[PDB]
């Protein structure tokens, strides 16, 4: 085989050049943009090859850590556009640190808890900042952040009685949920609601009545899921849809065959990463939204007794995704991003890392099989495919809240 | 009146007409986290927004203030909600507000709040007369804007404006036949008008799609649409399609065509086709070709399909 200091890469194989776009001599905006990205990516790939010498890939953990540590405390005015998503920023940063196995000082943990408490609304749920109306996005993020901290102090911050009332206040008769009072409706809400309701043990038999059916209506001719019935299949909305159904134990409401074929088709043959929609560009954040669907589908099919399922790999190219993330999505100054040429941000840092962890770790039943590309130190902590926080954090939180009654219900 | 970037703009803390109300600072706690270092102008507007919100002041000055708050952060849904409360309380001219949201969306077309606000206005007015044209302009700038397409489907379905959408679809497909959002709109229009059960309509669509495939063999959208309109009844229910694809294979053995053949074989085996052993063998051979050479990025998927086929039809 190869010496330990050289590791052959899929993206560097000579035959990999055959995977370049074939535009059939018919140019459109779509093919032109795709070709431009592939050209840049090939240049990047080649920079990691020195003829037969191919040094192991390195995740710049320390650089990422310092960037995250600073962001958790202060942000430049460049983030004014996210002033209504602060609990969300907290989650992105904390989950990134969690994946990197970077401890959270007790003081920082308490400060986060106090801040999220200030974001909690008297009517239930959390807003994008102190005094803001509650919204399912920051609510989902706040709950996840508190669970990552995992202390009784963090858990108890959540006003469970009002949270359940708040979810009821957003529930529509057709099974869908508004993102906030007087707000828009799409599959993101069903996932946010299912996520926080299941973690905090506040699910009632009627809360999600009709929700599974509404989500199934969102799956389209492509096999993927759109934001609302009729819309184009999209990785973000598909993750939300399937994850919510898994929580509701209603995955069978979907055509899992067309969904599986659709998501696997979203991995780019040349880049190795995933696109959000068919015929659109690769993007590091879809490393999670799309790739995260494979562990969910694996579980779904496994529950059905599928005898053909792998006992060692997810149904996507785990190595290629790792190659795309490690070679193309790291900012030398720390942080991760969409693709070469784009600037870093905490959102991409969170999801590029989340996707990398999914690609490195396979687990099913009593079987565990890791594939950590590059130096061993690249190994990230595992992440739960449904909630996207540590599996340990999920178990600890669910066990804690299961000891509490469902607010005003039996 | 005056915009945030206008030379004569004055901070709210310096406006005489606002002197009677005390600004309300944001309480982030003594030891802040994810603390944004706001500009003086940003904080000024929001300190006063918090004041009017806290006092629930349904006034014209409050209404004008939300405009600046929105320019500073159009993603602040709390401001948008309050602005709508004011629109009703003050009985503001909704057509004037439509012109406002039109300009706002043009500036920030990928924002959730602006499109929802527009939908609310259209619902309040029950006036969709400007929608299709406005949306077309947004799509002329970004033909794949998700929010634009979503709003377009809502308007068409809610106000029954189906008459010219297929023509619009054909127009955009001519511009970029690889635009997946347009192929989706195509399915949206047909399934909601004639439906696909009309065999004349289905044949028209299959013919059209095959022609697009011949023009651009590696455009995945057309292949996905072809499978999309035939999958529910079953790919094996269309015997002539298999023959036609097999004839094009030798000259167009793209991974899309090869994968489509496997999809057909899968369905055939699922419907007690004749020559089961032969079909299974052909399907397994293609799965290997896809996994090892033609579609290696999906090696695990194709290996899975190979094993699935054997678990279901070996005998």
């Amino acid at each position: 085989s190869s010496p330990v200091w050289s590791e052959p890469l899929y993206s560097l194989r000579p035959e990999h050049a055959r995977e370049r776009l074939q535009d059939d001599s018919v140019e459109t905006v779509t093919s032109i943009e795709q070709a431009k990205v592939e050209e840049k990516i090939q240049e990047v790939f080649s920079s990691y090859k020195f003829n037969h010498l191919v040094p192991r890939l390195v995740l710049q953990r320390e650089k990422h850590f310092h960037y995250l540590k600073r962001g958790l405390r202060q942000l430049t005015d460049a983030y004014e556009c996210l002033d209504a998503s602060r609990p969300t920023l907290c989650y992105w940063i904390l989950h990134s640190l969690e994946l990197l196995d970077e401890p959270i000082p007790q003081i920082v943990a308490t400060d986060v808890c106090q801040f999220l408490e200030l974001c909690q609304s008297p009517e239930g749920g959390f807003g994008g900042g102190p005094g803001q109306y509650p919204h399912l996005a920051p609510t989902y993020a706040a709950v996840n952040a508190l669970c990552i901290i995992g202390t009784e102090e963090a858990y108890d911050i959540i006003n469970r009685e009002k949270l359940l009332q708040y979810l009821y206040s957003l529930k529509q008769p057709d099974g869908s949920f508004l993102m906030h009072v007087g707000g828009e409706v799409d599959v993101r809400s069903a996932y946010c609601a299912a996520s926080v309701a299941s973690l905090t043990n506040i699910i009632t038999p009627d809360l999600f009545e009709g929700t599974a059916e509404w989500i199934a209506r969102c799956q389209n001719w492509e096999g993927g899921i759109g934001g609302v019935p009729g819309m184009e299949a999209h990785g973000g909305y598909t993750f939300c849809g399937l994850a919510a159904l898994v929580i509701l134990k209603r995955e069978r409401s979907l055509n899992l065959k067309s969904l599986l074929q659709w998501v696997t088709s979203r991995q780019m043959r040349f880049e190795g990463g995933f696109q959000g929609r068919c015929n659109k560009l690769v993007d590091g954040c879809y490393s999670f939204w799309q790739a995260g669907l494979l562990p969910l589908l694996h579980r779904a099919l496994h529950a059905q007794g599928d005898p053909a399922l792998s006992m060692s790999h997810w149904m996507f190219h785990q190595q290629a995704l790792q190659e795309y993330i490690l070679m193309c999505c790291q900012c030398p100054a720390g942080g991760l991003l969409d693709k070469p040429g784009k600037s870093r941000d905490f959102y991409h840092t969170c999801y590029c890392l989340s996707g990398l962890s999914i690609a490195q770790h396979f687990g099913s039943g009593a079987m565990l099989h890791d594939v950590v590309l590059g130096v061993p130190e690249n190994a990230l902590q595992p992440t739960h495919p449904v909630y996207n926080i540590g599996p340990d954090k999920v178990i600890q939180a669910t066990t804690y809240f299961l000891q509490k009654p469902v607010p005003g219900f039996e | 009146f005056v915009s945030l970037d206008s030379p004569s703009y004055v901070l709210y803390r310096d406006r005489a007409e606002w002197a009677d109300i005390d600004p309300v600072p944001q309480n982030d706690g003594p030891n802040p986290v994810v603390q944004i270092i706001y500009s003086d102008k940003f904080r000024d507007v929001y300190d006063y927004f918090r004041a009017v919100l806290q006092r629930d002041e349904r006034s014209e000055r409050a209404f004008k203030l939300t405009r600046d708050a929105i320019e500073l952060n159009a993603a602040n849904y709390t401001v948008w909600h309050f602005r709508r409360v004011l629109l009703k309380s003050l009985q503001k001219d909704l057509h004037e507000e439509m012109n406002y949201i039109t300009a706002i969306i043009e500036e920030q077309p990928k924002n959730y709040q602006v499109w929802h606000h527009r939908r609310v206005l259209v619902e309040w007015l029950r006036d969709p007369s400007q929608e299709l044209e406005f949306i077309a302009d947004i799509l002329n700038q970004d033909a794949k804007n998700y929010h634009a397409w979503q709003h377009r489907q809502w308007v068409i379905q809610e106000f029954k404006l189906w008459d010219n959408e297929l023509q619009y679809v054909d127009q955009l497909l001519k511009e970029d036949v690889r635009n997946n959002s347009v192929w989706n709109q195509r399915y949206f229009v047909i399934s909601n008008t004639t439906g696909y059960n009309d065999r004349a309509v289905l044949e028209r669509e299959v013919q059209y799609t095959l022609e697009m495939i011949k023009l651009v063999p590696h455009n995945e959208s057309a292949w996905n649409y072809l499978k999309g309109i035939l999958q529910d009844r079953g790919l094996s229910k269309y015997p002539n399609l298999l023959n036609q694809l097999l004839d094009l294979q030798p000259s167009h053995s793209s991974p899309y065509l090869i994968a489509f053949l496997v999809d057909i074989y899968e369905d055939m085996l699922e419907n007690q086709c004749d020559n089961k052993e032969d079909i299974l063998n052909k399907a397994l051979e293609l799965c290997e070709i896809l996994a090892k050479e033609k579609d290696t990025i999906r090696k695990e998927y194709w290996r899975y399909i190979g094993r699935s086929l054997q678990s279901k039809h070996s005998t």
């Binding site: 998503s85 969300t88 920051p138 993101r188 | 993603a75």
Partner: peptide, 4 residues
């Protein structure tokens, strides 16, 4: 990439 706006989520909300």
């Amino acid at each position: 990439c706006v989520l909300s």
